[PDB]
Amino acid sequence: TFLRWAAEPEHDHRKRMGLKMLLMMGLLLPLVYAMKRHKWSVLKSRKLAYRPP
Amino acid sequence: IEKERDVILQELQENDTSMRDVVFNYLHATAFQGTPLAQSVEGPSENVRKLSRADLTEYLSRHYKAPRMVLAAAGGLEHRQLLDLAQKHFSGLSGTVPTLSPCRFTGSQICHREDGLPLAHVAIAVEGPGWAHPDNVALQVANAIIGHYDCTYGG
């Protein structure tokens, strides 16, 4: 236990950002994925036709 | 009925040229899609090639009615010279009918791409309030604040 701390004086803090990351990125990632699907929705629903004589 | 049924189909070829009228026909057909108002006024070719005397009879038999009609005139006359004539002729009118569905508004895009022409008539618009809504007075100004221009004004 002691030696792992030697080459990691940051373990107590790595997990802290280890956790802050998820509840942000897990929270953003849907929202951005929605803003994506928001703008693209014009083309996710776009129809065409062909009316020459 | 049959002769005019050809006259109509002659014109829907003509209004292809009336590019301004093409647009407003498209425009009303988008924002008010799914509603009656998206219809044109002259109608599709198909219905004109299926129309009947009776549908017109029914159409005539429902809309031309005194409570939803108006007479008006102006000039060198009097309002009482006229009042007898309505009491003379239109007194025999049938004085006795659905109401309106609120026609919604849509924000939608339509585009009839056609590169073979000289130019492109274009239109854009939004929801309007309607008749009785008083701010229409204000908007008629703002249309005139922006005004208009067409290739001739020496200003």
Tab-separated table of N, CA, C and O in Angstrom, chain A residues 42 51, chain B residues 109 112:
chain	number	residue	atom	x	y	z
A	42	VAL	N	-33.790	18.331	-39.458
A	42	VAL	CA	-34.285	18.828	-40.733
A	42	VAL	C	-34.062	17.789	-41.815
A	42	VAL	O	-34.894	17.610	-42.711
A	51	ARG	N	-40.724	16.079	-60.523
A	51	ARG	CA	-41.884	16.507	-61.301
A	51	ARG	C	-41.483	17.252	-62.569
A	51	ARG	O	-41.791	18.440	-62.722
B	109	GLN	N	-39.793	24.625	-44.664
B	109	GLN	CA	-39.096	25.055	-45.859
B	109	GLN	C	-39.544	24.214	-47.039
B	109	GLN	O	-39.781	23.009	-46.919
B	112	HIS	N	-38.234	24.364	-54.796
B	112	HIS	CA	-38.386	23.742	-56.107
B	112	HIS	C	-37.188	24.175	-56.943
B	112	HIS	O	-37.242	25.108	-57.743
